[PDB]
Write a protein that binds this ligand. Structure first.
Ligand SMILES: *[C@@H]1O[C@H](CO)[C@@H](O[C@@H]2O[C@H](CO)[C@@H](O[C@@H]3O[C@H](CO[C@H]4O[C@H](CO)[C@@H](O)[C@H](O)[C@@H]4O)[C@@H](O)[C@H](O[C@H]4O[C@H](CO)[C@@H](O)[C@H](O)[C@@H]4O[C@H]4O[C@H](CO)[C@@H](O)[C@H](O)[C@@H]4O)[C@@H]3O)[C@H](O)[C@H]2NC(C)=O)[C@H](O)[C@H]1NC(C)=O
Ligand SMILES: *[C@@H]1O[C@H](CO)[C@@H](O[C@@H]2O[C@H](CO)[C@@H](O[C@@H]3O[C@H](CO)[C@@H](O)[C@H](O[C@H]4O[C@H](CO)[C@@H](O)[C@H](O)[C@@H]4O)[C@@H]3O)[C@H](O)[C@H]2NC(C)=O)[C@H](O)[C@H]1NC(C)=O
Ligand SMILES: *[C@@H]1O[C@H](CO)[C@@H](O[C@@H]2O[C@H](CO)[C@@H](O)[C@H](O)[C@H]2NC(C)=O)[C@H](O)[C@H]1NC(C)=O
Ligand SMILES: *[C@@H]1O[C@H](CO)[C@@H](O)[C@H](O)[C@H]1NC(C)=O
Ligand SMILES: *[C@@H]1O[C@H](CO)[C@@H](O)[C@H](O)[C@H]1NC(C)=O
Ligand SMILES: *[C@@H]1O[C@H](CO)[C@@H](O)[C@H](O)[C@H]1NC(C)=O
Ligand SMILES: *[C@@H]1O[C@H](CO)[C@@H](O)[C@H](O)[C@H]1NC(C)=O
Ligand SMILES: *[C@@H]1O[C@H](CO)[C@@H](O)[C@H](O)[C@H]1NC(C)=O
Ligand SMILES: *[C@@H]1O[C@H](CO)[C@@H](O)[C@H](O)[C@H]1NC(C)=O
Ligand SMILES: *[C@@H]1O[C@H](CO)[C@@H](O)[C@H](O)[C@H]1NC(C)=O
Ligand SMILES: *[C@@H]1O[C@H](CO)[C@@H](O)[C@H](O)[C@H]1NC(C)=O
Ligand SMILES: *[C@@H]1O[C@H](CO)[C@@H](O)[C@H](O)[C@H]1NC(C)=O
Ligand SMILES: *[C@@H]1O[C@H](CO)[C@@H](O)[C@H](O)[C@H]1NC(C)=O
Ligand SMILES: *[C@@H]1O[C@H](CO)[C@@H](O)[C@H](O)[C@H]1NC(C)=O
Ligand SMILES: *[C@@H]1O[C@H](CO)[C@@H](O)[C@H](O)[C@H]1NC(C)=O
Ligand SMILES: *[C@@H]1O[C@H](CO)[C@@H](O)[C@H](O)[C@H]1NC(C)=O
Ligand SMILES: *[C@@H]1O[C@H](CO)[C@@H](O)[C@H](O)[C@H]1NC(C)=O
Ligand SMILES: *[C@@H]1O[C@H](CO)[C@@H](O)[C@H](O)[C@H]1NC(C)=O
Ligand SMILES: *[C@@H]1O[C@H](CO)[C@@H](O)[C@H](O)[C@H]1NC(C)=O
Ligand SMILES: *[C@@H]1O[C@H](CO)[C@@H](O)[C@H](O)[C@H]1NC(C)=O
Ligand SMILES: *[C@@H]1O[C@H](CO)[C@@H](O)[C@H](O)[C@H]1NC(C)=O
Ligand SMILES: *[C@@H]1O[C@H](CO)[C@@H](O)[C@H](O)[C@H]1NC(C)=O
Ligand SMILES: *[C@@H]1O[C@H](CO)[C@@H](O)[C@H](O)[C@H]1NC(C)=O
Ligand SMILES: *[C@@H]1O[C@H](CO)[C@@H](O)[C@H](O)[C@H]1NC(C)=O
Lengths: 123, 121, 436, 121, 121, 48, 48
């Protein structure tokens, strides 16, 4: 029942700015924390960013801490990642997923229970 | 020291150096009891309000609510050097409750956010 | 795994008994001492709160009782004390030619009353109701001389029951049942929170509840037990029954000074014919009212039975009759025309009413009030909104008018409210650990 | 906002979003003064209790006392999503003083520990 | 536990371990009201004074005002191990207001310093 | 024996005993009491 | 040792005709006066 659909650009020259938006359905969007996980075509999975359910708190992997912004709009059920600088090493398939955190009064997560199809971003 | 309210005619910047003078003087048969009880209620209402905003232990409490300009379009020199607190209180009267509401909302998010940050092993 | 987290501002409460303060938008009840009301009061519906109410253990009634007694006594203290009235009276029947029910009422009593100067006396003639003058073996005395002094009510202070609101202090809240079928006790699933109650008129009456507030949908019968016939049964009506009652005599009031600054008021004479005071309740409306009451009583006592209404048993006039204030005058209506029927499985009822000027109110002994006369004809129109019934100690049940414990009238009006103490603290497990 | 106690019928999680509303309504001849003084004494006793626990400026305060299961063996879903604070109050009533005692002891240890750490050059 | 004031005859060190016992006991017809109000006024004046010093939430609060020796030339063992608090209060009575004045100035400077530090982007 | 001064004869001396001394005291007369009303609700009691 | 603190740059609007200190002074004087006379001989026997 749970679906995550990632829509965004697939090509950007180095130094470009792009946005990826993951729209969720089949569950209460505002009840789950969500994150983005990156996988270069020849590499394994890499965690990139994590956002809370409310959106007040954001965390990033050190490699992108000064260049990527994660935000979510809970009324449209949409999680968006805005990338800046977009240096070559960021060419990869990006996936959005639920999980990775809970808001203190919920059972813990620290795992990604639902994954989207992903989107390939070429730098 | 200028004494109780002695800074009332001074600029807001200069007046900010005497906050403890008025704070001390906020606390320091039916009529006697009603007036002193009333003084206590006013003190506690102000302390409760600071508590809600997360300012319970401070006289100068720096918060996370941005200034919206419409409330007052004066720059920092025009406000802190060329005005007294009485003039400011008159100028900002119509926006006082708006600011207070925003202060409450900001602290609520911070407490919830802190609660979540402390839940990360 | 989980840690204790402390919360302050938790929306919980516990049953509590605290002091309430009056609110109200001269009068016996001191709205001057009371606080002005909120012109736009709030009421907050609790969507999923069910709470248990008990109108018979509600301490708001006991506090209202003490406040009414206190305000009454404070009102009478700054008034003329009629110590010079406990004198020998020489009384004759005012009119020996009456052929009406009023024959024997209204005695023309003469006495040597004091004057402003201590060295002088004046001869005073006044009319007293028969109930106020008792023969001393013609020679009469006032009925109160046997037990107490009389404080004269101030003629400038109205007896109109102006609404009084009870408002809780900060830290406490009042819960309103808002349940159209609530019988006065048990779970109430439609509780809303108010800080203060609606205004309550301190209407003083026995047997019948006047004004106050009507039931929204049907007659509601409230009793602490039902099974125990010694308890009063409070019946809240769905529709009001108008009772049009008057004191038809055009009493002319005269006054004299009885000491320095001490003015005494008395009925001087009556202009025109002497007529009996009375109440008028429509027969059709009352019969419908009783029909509603009988079906609601049958729901608790059983069907295929006989419900009888009868006149009240003997006892003090205040209890055996329908006592009430009208215009500042005190009426004691017979009521037997309203409770004279057996219910088995325009054309009004006129009730005689007695007038009494010496009132021994609140069932107390040691205090008395002289109700001064009112010039002219007195007419009141009021709504009968409930009854106080008792049951005889069987196929047939018999119900009679009751009353005399004034707290039950306030129990009827306060059935919707409960006072609770707010407990803003609580603890709960969370995953949030204080950073050491 | 649902107003004072509007969240009373809501779940424990949802009602946590209204903690400031009830706090405001705790402060806002002889009979009136006794009622006002009583409201003040109850407010201050609760604030003193929070102070002893180190929660003087917070509406939501996290502590270092573990939950001991015996107090309540419900999981977080049952407590926060399927219960109201009134139901919890009743469930945890018999253990409230135990928890309060532990909270006091925890803060005392932290104050001593803090005092020692601030003594290290 | 020794109960309220049971530590009065104990050493200052040992007595510092019972601060919550007395703290609970500062808060817990006209005469009853007046005394209740007076107890509230004394409690609030002491809490307000702690707030001025930045100690509003602590029973043991460390400060940044050095000891001037003239106030008391005893060593730490002479004060904390060989004396009671009653003896100390008598010994330090003449300097109490001096110390309080210094504490006020220190907190005022600290609030300005915090205000300036929070203004560095 | 407690006193503000002892030496000053103008002060009272309060003596606290170690053991009590019983004092058996009576009014042996079998007084029969009467009462009258002296005003409206005002009763006066006297030995009859 | 009463204090007075001069406000060097404060100008304020006064209005002695709406000053509520007067109403309290009046009420207090009336109250003192009546309390003073209350515990005194009341000459009702003099009105002869
Ligand atoms: C403090 O201490 C003092 C002593 O220092 C003490 O005083 C004594 O009080 C008692 C009463 O309690 C007195 O007792 C009376 O004594 C006489 C004489 O009794 C002697 O003679 C008879 C002869 O038969 C002997 O049996 C007896 O042992 C003695 O030798 C009696 O006449 C009195 O009796 C009358 O009063 C009694 C009270 O209950 C009645 O029961 C009794 O029937 C008598 O009265 C009735 O009968 C009379 C018949 O004649 C009739 O006339 C009466 O109207 C009535 O109907 C009584 O016992 C004793 O003398 C006192 N002693 C001294 C030295 O004065 C205090 O009592 C004590 N106080 C306290 C508080 O502790
Ligand atoms: C139940 O409620 C009804 C309706 O509220 C109530 O009946 C009303 O009673 C009052 C007081 O008796 C009536 O108002 C009076 O009407 C006459 C008409 O001439 C006026 O003279 C009165 O004012 C004069 O007298 C007062 C005496 O104190 C003075 O204070 C005043 O300054 C004036 O001199 C006064 O307005 C009112 O008319 C009736 N209402 C109707 C519709 O008849 C009834 O009493 C309540 N039930 C009980 C048991 O009290
Ligand atoms: C009310 O009026 C009726 C008469 O209309 C009185 O009823 C009488 O009561 C006495 C006892 O007091 C009985 O012996 C009579 O048989 C009754 N007569 C009727 C016709 O019912 C009644 O007592 C009156 N009540 C008061 C309090 O005055
Ligand atoms: C009043 O204003 C003058 C300048 O006009 C200034 O020198 C003086 O210090 C001010 N007084 C106070 C108390 O601030
Ligand atoms: C400033 O206030 C106005 C209303 O006076 C409001 O429309 C506007 O959004 C506010 N601006 C911000 C940034 O909050
Ligand atoms: C506040 O609003 C009123 C509305 O009449 C206006 O007259 C007044 O000048 C306003 N004050 C400020 C400081 O904006
Ligand atoms: C007054 O009327 C009553 C009616 O019973 C009668 O008993 C009484 O004797 C009458 N009094 C006089 C003085 O005629
Ligand atoms: C008033 O006093 C006179 C004195 O002679 C007496 O005759 C008369 O009966 C008294 N009047 C009344 C009504 O008692
Ligand atoms: C006086 O009061 C007593 C109280 O029991 C009562 O029995 C008696 O009847 C009263 N006197 C008269 C004349 O009614
Ligand atoms: C009111 O209804 C409750 C419902 O439980 C019942 O227990 C109680 O006996 C009823 N009381 C009366 C007087 O009908
Ligand atoms: C009154 O109610 C109780 C239950 O609370 C019941 O046991 C008792 O029988 C009732 N009274 C009578 C006289 O039956
Ligand atoms: C009472 O008097 C009013 C006056 O308007 C009248 O409309 C009403 O019908 C009367 N009611 C009865 C029961 O007589
Ligand atoms: C009472 O009786 C006397 C007898 O002389 C008479 O003068 C007086 O008018 C009567 N009073 C009234 C009010 O009728
Ligand atoms: C009573 O009689 C007097 C005599 O003039 C008259 O003025 C007054 O209006 C009458 N009152 C009534 C209510 O009829
Ligand atoms: C009687 O009840 C009706 C209900 O609508 C109300 O309008 C009317 O004013 C009431 N009458 C009195 C006298 O309170
Ligand atoms: C009451 O419970 C219902 C159950 O569906 C819920 O939707 C509603 O939000 C609850 N009320 C409040 C005030 O939270
Ligand atoms: C938990 O409570 C039990 C009693 O039910 C007690 O024996 C145990 O020591 C407690 N554990 C902790 C860690 O407080
Ligand atoms: C608390 O103790 C009482 C003692 O009678 C017991 O009935 C009740 O169930 C206990 N509550 C809990 C939640 O253990
Ligand atoms: C009193 O002093 C003695 C000295 O040995 C010590 O053992 C004892 O603990 C002291 N009492 C308290 C209450 O500290
Ligand atoms: C200590 O106090 C003395 C006065 O007793 C003062 O002269 C001296 O400067 C103070 N020392 C310090 C370091 O503040
Ligand atoms: C405090 O001052 C008084 C002034 O008389 C003096 O006697 C006393 O010794 C002083 N105490 C200390 C500890 O300096
Ligand atoms: C009590 O004993 C003390 C011991 O110092 C002594 O000074 C005082 O004078 C004595 N007082 C009396 C009244 O014996
Ligand atoms: C009373 O006591 C004082 C000390 O307070 C002492 O000087 C005086 O000598 C005493 N009285 C006499 C008569 O000695
Ligand atoms: C007082 O003396 C009179 C004189 O006749 C007598 O009747 C009365 O009984 C005496 N009183 C007592 C108490 O002996």
């Amino acid at each position: 029942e749970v679906q995550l659909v990632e829509t965004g650009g697939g090509l950007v020259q180095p130094g470009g700015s792009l946005k990826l938006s993951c729209r969720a359905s089949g569950y209460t969007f505002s009840s789950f924390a969500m994150s983005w996980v990156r996988q270069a075509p020849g590499k394994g999975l890499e965690w990139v960013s994590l956002i809370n359910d409310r959106g007040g708190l954001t965390f990033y992997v050190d490699s992108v801490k000064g260049r990527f912004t994660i935000s979510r709009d809970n009324s449209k059920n949409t999680l968006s990642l805005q990338m800046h600088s977009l240096r070559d090493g960021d060419t990869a398939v990006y996936y959005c997923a639920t999980g990775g955190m809970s808001s203190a009064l919920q059972s813990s997560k620290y795992y990604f229970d639902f994954w989207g199809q992903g989107a390939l971003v070429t730098v | 020291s200028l004494g109780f309210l002695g800074a009332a005619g001074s600029t807001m910047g200069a007046a900010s150096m005497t906050l403890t003078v008025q704070a001390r003087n906020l606390l320091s048969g039916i009529k006697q009891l009603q007036a002193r009880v009333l003084a206590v209620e006013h003190y506690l209402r102000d302390q409760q309000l600071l508590g809600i905003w997360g300012c319970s232990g401070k006289l100068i409490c720096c918060t996370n609510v941005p200034w919206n300009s419409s409330w007052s379009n004066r720059n920092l020199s025009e406000i802190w050097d060329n005005m007294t607190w009485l003039q400011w209180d008159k100028e900002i009267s119509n926006y006082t409750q708006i600011i207070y509401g925003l202060l409450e909302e900001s602290q609520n998010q911070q407490e919830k956010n802190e609660q979540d940050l402390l839940a990360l092993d | 795994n989980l840690w204790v987290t402390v919360y302050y501002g938790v929306p919980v409460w516990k049953d509590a008994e605290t002091t309430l303060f009056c609110a109200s938008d001269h009068n016996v009840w001191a709205t001057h001492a009371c606080v002005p009301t909120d012109p736009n009061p709030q009421e907050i519906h609790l969507e999923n709160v069910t709470e248990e109410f008990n109108m018979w253990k509600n301490n708001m009634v006991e506090q209202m009782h003490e406040d009414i007694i206190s305000l009454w006594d404070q009102s009478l203290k700054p008034c003329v004390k009629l110590t010079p009235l406990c004198v020998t009276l020489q009384c004759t029947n005012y009119t020996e030619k009456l052929r009406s029910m009023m024959k024997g009422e209204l005695k023309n009593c003469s006495f040597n009353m004091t004057t402003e100067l201590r060295d002088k006396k004046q001869k005073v003639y006044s009319l007293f109701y028969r109930l106020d003058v008792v023969q001393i073996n013609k020679e009469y005395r006032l009925i109160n001389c046997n037990t107490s002094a009389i404080t004269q009510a101030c003629p400038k202070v109205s007896f109109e029951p102006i609404p009084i609101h009870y408002c809780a202090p900060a830290g406490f809240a009042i819960l309103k049942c808002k349940d159209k079928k609530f019988n006065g006790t048990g779970p109430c699933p439609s509780v809303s929170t108010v800080q203060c109650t609606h205004g309550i008129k301190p209407v003083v009456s026995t047997q019948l509840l006047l004004n106050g507030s009507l039931a929204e949908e049907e007659v509601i019968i409230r009793s602490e037990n039902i099974t125990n016939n010694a308890k009063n049964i409070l019946v809240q009506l769905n529709t009001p029954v108008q009772i049009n009652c008057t004191r038809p005599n055009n009493n002319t009031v005269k006054s004299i000074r009885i000491g320095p600054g001490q003015a005494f008021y008395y009925t001087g004479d009556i202009i025109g014919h002497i007529r009996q005071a009375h109440c008028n309740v429509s027969k059709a409306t009352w019969n419908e009212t009783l029909g509603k009451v009988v079906k609601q009583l049958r729901k608790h006592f059983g069907n295929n039975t006989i419900i009888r209404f009868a006149q009240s048993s003997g006892g003090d006039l205040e209890v055996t009759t329908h006592s009430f204030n009208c215009g500042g005058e005190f009426f004691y209506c017979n009521t037997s025309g309203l409770f004279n029927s057996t219910w088995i499985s325009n054309d009004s009822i006129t009730l005689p009413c007695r007038i009494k000027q010496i009132i021994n109110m609140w069932q107390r002994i040691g205090q008395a009030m002289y109700a001064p006369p009112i010039q002219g004809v007195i007419r009141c129109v009021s709504n009968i909104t409930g009854l106080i019934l008792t049951r005889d100690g069987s196929t047939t049940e018999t119900f009679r008018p009751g009353g005399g414990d004034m707290r039950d009238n306030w129990r009827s009006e306060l059935y919707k409210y409960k006072v609770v103490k707010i407990e803003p603290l609580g603890v709960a497990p969370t995953r949030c650990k204080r950073r050491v």
